[PDB]
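Q: Hi! First time asking for a complex rather than a single chain. Here are the components, and I think there are two in total. Is that enough to go on?
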Amino acid sequence: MNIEELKKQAETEIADFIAQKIAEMNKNTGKEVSEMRFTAREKMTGLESYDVKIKIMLEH
Amino acid sequence: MNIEELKKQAETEIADFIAQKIAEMNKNTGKEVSEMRFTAREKMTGLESYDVKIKIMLEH
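A: Yes, that's all I need. Here is the structure of the assembled complex.
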């Protein structure tokens, strides 16, 4: 499998995982996720992950 | 379960999923993921997901 295909595959997997998490959150809270912040988690050995902060909105 | 706890849970799940994907990619390519770009995928019904673009670096 080539590098491009691996990349597109993982991109789709992550997008799909995030979509499921948002659907789940919206369902469970009765509210709406408006945004997620992603902050790189980097080590001397390189990028490890992104830490996530979920923003949920509600009526004033 | 409260809204805060649900949030922290989903944040951790997403961070962990991304970390696994990066470890996987690095292993499979012999290279290094340097960055991921996240671009909101929004609909009139609200935020659906984030689309992802993975950047991989290699030696000049």
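A: The longest helix of chain B spans residues 3-29. Let me know if you'd like any chain examined more closely.
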